[PDB]
Amino acid sequence: EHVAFGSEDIENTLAKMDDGQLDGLAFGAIQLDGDGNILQYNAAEGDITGRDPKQVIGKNFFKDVAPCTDSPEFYGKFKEGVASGNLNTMFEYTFDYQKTPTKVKVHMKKALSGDSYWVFVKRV
Ligand SMILES: *C(=O)/C=C/c1ccc(O)cc1
Secondary structure, three states: OOOOOOOOOHHHHHHHOOHHHHOOOOOEEEEEOOOOEEEEEOHHHHHHHOOOHHHHOOOEHHHHHOHHHOOHHHHHHHHHHHHHOOOEEEEEEEEOOOOOOEEEEEEEEEOOOOOOEEEEEEEO
């Protein structure tokens, strides 16, 4: 799937993708509901993070899978965007719960579909 991390229209392009198409992206992609529950989780994200894309669906990202992101800098930005109904933020972050500290770039962007939000990840 020919789509770049950070592209302006990413939410329009990713509205059409099934599981298999999301798995063809060059970067990690997670779709969360407004509470942080995982709706979609692609193969590229599992390759970066070691998590099993099949097992994480239905878990809460902030409570269960990713406690290192339960902080004002990540979760706080997420919830502020859910509350406002708009979200488009990029930042760097370190993942160090199950892994050697690993720095990534994160892009969170409200989806087109209802009650859903994207978290995109790539290595830096
Ligand atoms: C810190 O606990 C981060 C965990 C994490 C980041 C991204 C994922 O896709 C899965 C777990």
